[PDB]
Amino acid sequence: ALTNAQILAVIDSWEETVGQFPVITHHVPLGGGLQGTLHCYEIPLAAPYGVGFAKNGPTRWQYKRTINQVVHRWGSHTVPFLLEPDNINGKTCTASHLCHNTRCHNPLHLCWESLDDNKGRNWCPGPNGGCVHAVVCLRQGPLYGPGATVAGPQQRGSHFVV
Amino acid sequence: ALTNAQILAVIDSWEETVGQFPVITHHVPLGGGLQGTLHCYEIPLAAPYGVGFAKNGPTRWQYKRTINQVVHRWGSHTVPFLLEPDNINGKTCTASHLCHNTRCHNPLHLCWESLDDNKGRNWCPGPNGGCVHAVVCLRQGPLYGPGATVAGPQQRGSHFVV
DNA sequence: TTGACTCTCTTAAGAGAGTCA
DNA sequence: TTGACTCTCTTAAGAGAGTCA
Ligand code: NA
Ligand code: NA
Ligand SMILES: [Zn+2]
Ligand SMILES: [Zn+2]
Ligand SMILES: [Zn+2]
Ligand SMILES: [Zn+2]
């Protein structure tokens, strides 16, 4: 299939196209009561999206290039990582939004990690709130906090101990 | 079933039966370098499981009772919460294992909360490591830690800023 | 070769309901 | 009435592949 040089060319064309997406400034919690700023490069809400891009689901897109008469297609956020290993610890690598903004395709807002690691960032206290992720979070996770638990642990009788 | 007395009777029979499950001691990380001990009441691996209980999936069970000559059935971990609201902020309430042990049916190890709150406990630093859950965690989440990220945010050109 | 649609699948925290004996 | 099986569905973080012009 594609040589590593051809893969680099795909990454470069992807960056050139994404770099022309609308750039949206967002103020975000960092943890520790501090606020910061992220600049997201947001794919449009409806077609046309940009050269090579098409929507396969409500918040899913793919990037497609045809090379030597063969059509190649990738998940739209996976392209920055095409020269990296695609699994770790027996788990598939996934594109993980550090900005928690699905439409964003800024490669400086993405990392490449297991789906469990990816999901867990939703609850991280953030880079100024105690983040221990080795590839550090850019912001506090949107779901961090005390939660909204309706009922806690309880028993009616005396059959149980903790 | 319908009446509050009938619901109370269901909860009481469930507690009596689960109270006879084997009690298994598990030592657990609490965060902050500390360890604690939990006593889980574990449903058997194979039939018979206990009066009223049947397995509907590899780690899914249901509890069943006949009331007014009709069968009423519930997810096996939902029974303690039958007098509670079944939603919160428009999200379905779910049984959430504070001990992260699916076979356990100890109601002192369960709470009732949105699926997002439920999931997020997998990454909590724990009651001695910074848990902020209002209904406090019993242990550090099994997935807490630095992660195993294969590649971090990166660009080849100069089109992007954080 | 390209755009704009269509479809189903993965994961791991959770669910509801039917078929037999 | 009770037990022991069978099936598919929900969610929100993520995927692969087909059709037509
Ligand atoms: Na994510
Ligand atoms: Na859980
Ligand atoms: Zn972004
Ligand atoms: Zn983090
Ligand atoms: Zn337990
Ligand atoms: Zn917690």
Residue numbers in the entry:
A (entry chain A): 2 to 163
B (entry chain B): 202 to 363
What does the primary publication say about this deposited structure?
A large subfamily of one-metal-ion-dependent nucleases consist of histidine-metal (His-Me) nucleases that perform critical tasks in biological pathways such as apoptosis, extracellular defense, intracellular immunity (CRISPR–Cas9), and intron homing (homing endonuclease). The asparagine residue helps to stabilize metal ion binding whereas the strictly conserved histidine is suggested to deprotonate a nearby water for nucleophilic attack toward the scissile phosphate.
Next, we removed malonate in the crystallization buffer, which may chelate metal ions and hinder metal ion diffusion, by equilibrating the crystals in 200 mM NaCl buffer at pH 6, 7, or 8 for 30 min. The diffraction quality of the crystals was not affected during the soaking. On the leaving group side of the scissile phosphate, the metal exhibited an octahedral geometry, being coordinated by three water molecules, two oxygen atoms from the scissile phosphate, and the conserved asparagine. During the reaction, the coordination distances of the metal ion ligands decreased 0.1–0.2 Å when Mg2+ exchanged with Na+, which is consistent with their preferred geometry (Cowan, 2002).
